[PDB]
Symmetry: C3
Subunit: 353 residues, 3 copies
């Protein structure tokens, strides 16, 4: 029963993995998520405010939902990962409330050995469901995993093909009918509505967050994400980094929190277009971030909210006033994340019943 | 939309700031507050105990209420602070329960440039309200803030004038009618009641707490307090301290927790007379504290509880058996906080209906 | 009122201590316990899953119950401890739910001075009760405590005599009637039931956890455990270790979490036979663990669950594939804990009403 877990040669294309340890998310998790990342989006922070605008109660931060659903997959898929690399085709179907239980099922949809035959990239489609089987989250990710025995031979290889953009039209049925007049701009922390954003606008978030060892471990276990490279200062000595790698998701959550400085009314996340973990983060490193409007979509059947398509780029140890990005055939050396996603935002303020 | 925040030259006397991100405080926050500071006051720790003595449920620790209400003001007032300096005229109007939402409004009531023209002291009156607009917390604080451009000229300057003591008579209507017979001294951890304290009594708390980097960051984000000097190990290199300053409130909470060793039945805080952040705390530094009875007040219209006026002084890296205080024209070098406040305490144990 | 606490010479055999600060355990504590230790046992993690199998709601992790009940005793017994040493005769009478309040009473049942006359071992029987006085936890522990004055003389000395095994027959009335068919092996993360374990089976847990300073302090205060040696980087300089000792219970919780890798369906703990803190853990040290089946007991009056008797041994900085244990007259140098306990596990999967 000694189980070092699954390695790259153990995956067979088209297998469905029915992940263990479904997770009841409570106001315990909300309070710890708030203290690990410091997000200040009022919909999630204030029940009073959420209720007035047309929610039943504050919904979970969409990234608390995401890290929990991802977490459940880690024991089977990425326990023996060296790094999670990217995402595509992400959809937040349903908002999630404290007391709800989240479960995850993954489908192996790609496998590509690395040239050294020491590792492969595993591609999965992961689907999270509430206790009654209703989908709440769908996404694709790919992660670089260890082979147990490098001399082993990779049966079938397949780099799958993924939409680099989700279609706003399928995100329309996500958020319940809201009241954009009840939405109190002063309590939400910005006057800027759907119509105040221009395609091409660039936003430095200014604020920096230095990440301590204990912070990312406490976050990573909260998600019940077991990837040994987060936790084992002994074993990681024998990796390329030689020390504990911070959960990629920790950077996504930190960048989202910072993004409140300019995008406070992008209150909920509807889907993920593309994401890429460019570079790893270590304890003692400082995160900064900057964002861009790529599209501004109206939602078929709705006038309360539209959708912003956004690109957010995070750095370590480098302010983003100069908007760091590409630099030759690759990124500026300070870039650690490049995330392309749809958020929701209120439209008009005219009171209706 | 790139916003480095408000600087000293941006404040205009008499402006009202209506702060963003109102905060629903849950049993998540209570559990994290308990783990960040270790307070052992039974009223807050045990619903069973609170209910018996005449509360509807355990109330929030008054400093969890305080750090949340302060927190909401930080983005507008002290995001660009170098240090929060003092308090006066603090009143805990109403106890607060899990599920309640807290909002903050501040009034700029003072401005004084520093001699180097690099900084000014900003004086505010901050008022926290529940979701229905009822006041729960009022206080005055002053914080040393950065000027964006030092060559800038300060229009109007005003060091306001503040009562160095709150009047017990206005704290009477705070706590609901309690049962001081139901109050179980063994469960509360002290036999000492209102009548067992003498004016002039001095209490060393003995216990020390060493504060790690991750602890104060996790606490400071829980309060959604954004002051860059807490978080940015890069930017703080260019400050006088050259490293992250620990939230002043973290020291107040730690000193209050330690104070359980001698003041266990000073179960709730009614108001704040004067407070002064004497000196900063850094990661790795050890806190100790000692307290003094300054007054013992009966409350107009009540026999269940009286009010102790208390002075609590915290040190770093120095036990308080010698009761460190002043030392010439200024404090003993180890002193970091000097806090003068009213707490509540049960009187007589005679059972009534 | 300056109280450095109780020292070895202050205990009198046969005294009952009625401990202060009873503790309401909430979903705040559950979420923080989950993030401090990362346990993935589905009964505790998923209400949905617990309810289906025959609980009213997820019960508290038995070690969250244990650390809280132990915590309440620390101010009186072990505030001035150098190290907690062992356990015997542990019984989890009743599972515990969020909202319940826990109180502790201890009986001094042993005292033995150390040869240097600087310290003694104090032996206690500690009993935790819900708010209505019903017992939930009973155990014996012994801890090495400081004498205030070494020249002091120890009146009565007594090393009591303790059963090295609890009897499965008295654990039968602990867990409510469950449904072992409703128990979803895929959601619980193991197909192995009562009947799949063999006496003599050995299980390496593979996974390692490196423990940071802030992690054990945040955990130790959550339990409201005050032992100065956990917290005071100044005072601990003058101890044999010269630095902060990590709560022994932190190692028990970490080893239990790791043990999910092979014992996922040992879902609840019924009692503790023997436990020994072999060696201390420090910040930066990495924990690993391995377990053994010692007995497999059926429960008088029940067919849903049986009892496994288990031995789990934790190490620091040494993988357990070689199953480290004894090595001459004493343990392998890497061993830090040797814990002998009864857990519960489902039997047959045949659906009944």
């Amino acid at each position: 029963k000694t189980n070092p877990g699954r390695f790259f040669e153990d995956f067979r294309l088209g297998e469905t993995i029915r992940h263990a340890t479904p997770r009841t998310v409570t106001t315990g998790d909300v309070a710890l998520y708030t203290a690990l990342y410091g997000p200040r989006f009022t919909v999630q922070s204030s029940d009073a405010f959420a209720k007035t605008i047309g929610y039943p109660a504050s919904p979970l931060d969409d990234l608390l939902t995401f890290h929990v659903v991802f977490g459940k997959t880690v024991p089977d898929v990425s326990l023996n990962a060296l790094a999670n690399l990217g995402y595509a085709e992400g959809g937040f179907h349903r908002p999630v409330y404290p007391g709800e239980t989240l479960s995850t099922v993954s489908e192996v949809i790609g496998l590509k050995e690395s040239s050294n035959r020491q590792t492969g990239v595993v591609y999965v489609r992961s689907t999270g469901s509430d206790a009654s089987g209703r989908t709440v989250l769908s996404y694709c990710r790919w992660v670089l995993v260890r082979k147990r025995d490098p001399e082993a031979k990779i049966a079938e290889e397949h780099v799958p093909q993924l939409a680099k953009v989700v279609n706003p039209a399928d995100l329309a049925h996500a958020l319940p009918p809201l009241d954009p007049a009840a939405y109190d701009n002063a309590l939400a922390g910005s006057p800027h509505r759907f119509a105040d954003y221009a395609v091409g606008e660039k936003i430095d978030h200014v604020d920096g967050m230095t990440v301590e060892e204990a912070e990312h471990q406490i976050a990573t276990r909260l998600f019940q994400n077991t990837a040994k490279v987060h936790f084992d200062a002994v074993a990681t000595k024998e990796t390329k980094f030689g020390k504990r790698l911070i959960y990629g998701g920790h950077v996504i959550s930190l960048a989202r929190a910072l993004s409140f400085n300019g995008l406070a009314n992008a209150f909920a996340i509807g889907g993920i277009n593309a994401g890429r973990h460019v570079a790893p983060l270590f304890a003692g490193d400082t995160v900064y971030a900057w964002s861009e409007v790529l599209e501004t979509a109206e939602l078929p059947g709705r006038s309360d909210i539209g959708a912003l398509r956004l690109r957010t780029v995070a750095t370590k140890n480098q302010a983003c006033g100069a908007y760091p990005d590409k630099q030759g055939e690759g990124y500026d050396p300070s870039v650690i994340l490049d995330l392309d996603y749809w958020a929701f935002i209120p439209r008009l303020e005219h009171h209706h019943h």
